[PDB]
Amino acid sequence: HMSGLKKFFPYSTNVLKGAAADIALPSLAGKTVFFYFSASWCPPCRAFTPQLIDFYKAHAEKKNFEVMLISWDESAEDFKDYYAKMPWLALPFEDRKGMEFLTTGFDVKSIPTLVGVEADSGNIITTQARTMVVKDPEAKDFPWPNVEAKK
Numbered sequence: 001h002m003s004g005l006k007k008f009f010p011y012s013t014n015v016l017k018g019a020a021a022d023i024a025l026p027s028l029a030g031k032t033v034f035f036y037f038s039a040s041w042c043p044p045c046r047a048f049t050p051q052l053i054d055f056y057k058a059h060a061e062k063k064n065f066e067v068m069l070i071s072w073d074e075s076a077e078d079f080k081d082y083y084a085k086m087p088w089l090a091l092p093f094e095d096r097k098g099m100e101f102l103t104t105g106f107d108v109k110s111i112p113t114l115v116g117v118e119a120d121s122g123n124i125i126t127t128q129a130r131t132m133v134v135k136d137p138e139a140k141d142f143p144w145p146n147v148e149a150k151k
Contacts, residue, residue: 001026001098001118002025002026002028002029002119003122004027004119004120004121004122004123005025005117005119005120005122006025006120006122007035007121008101008105008122009025009037009091009098010064010094010098010101010103011061011097011098012091012092012095012098012099015068015089015090015091015092016083016089016090016091016092017020017078017089018087021092023089025119028046028066028119029119029120030064030079030119030120031064031065031066031119031150032063032064032065032066032079032112032116032117032118032119032125032142032143033066033067033068033118033119034065034066034067034068034116034117034129035068035070035084035102035106035114035115035116035117036052036068036069036070036088036110036112036113037070037072037102037103037108037111037112037113037114037115038069038070038071038072038082038111039071039072039073039074039078039082039111040073040078040079040081040082041073041074041078042072042111042112044111044112045111045112047090047113048130048133049085049086049112051133052087052133052136053087053112055133055137055139056087056088056135057087058086059139059142061085063139063142065141065143066088067086067088067115068089068090069083069086069088069089069090069091070090070091070095070102070103071083071090071091071093072099072100072111073093074102076093078151079093080093081105090117093136096117106113106124106127107127108127112130113130114129114130114133115127115129116143116144117148118137125130125143125144125145125146126143126144126145126146126147127141127147127148128144128147128148129144129147132144
């Protein structure tokens with residue numbers, strides 16, 4: 001029952017997929033999951049989002065991963081407009097305390113940030129996936145464990 005992955009969600013059960021709000025964690029079984037910390041008020045986020053969408057189109061089926069928006073937006077309206085541009089999942093905006101839990105858990109101090117985790121185990125791969133989407137657009141070294149090792 002996705003115990004490892006459940007550890008990331010103390011206050012949500014199902015998450016969003018477009019207009020649907022009934023996506024359950026077991027649907028992510030066997031995949032890599034990326035938490036995308038982002039907001040519509042952030043210029044580099046607005047520019048990185050389309051790069052991440054290009055990467056998702058190219059590799060999200062073959063490399064077997066999913067993306068979930070963890071929003072730093074200032075309002076429900078901003079969240080709705082921004083998330084509507086995206087093809088992936090989102091932690092519901094209403095779960096602000098859950099967004100805080102993940103933000104501190106991964107020591108996210110700025111955005112955009114992209115964190116990779118294993119769905120089955122719940123283990124962490126890297127917190128520096130944003131760098132790699134840009135540097136490795138063909139996904140040759142995906143999912144990039146321990147990018148943190150770099151100088």
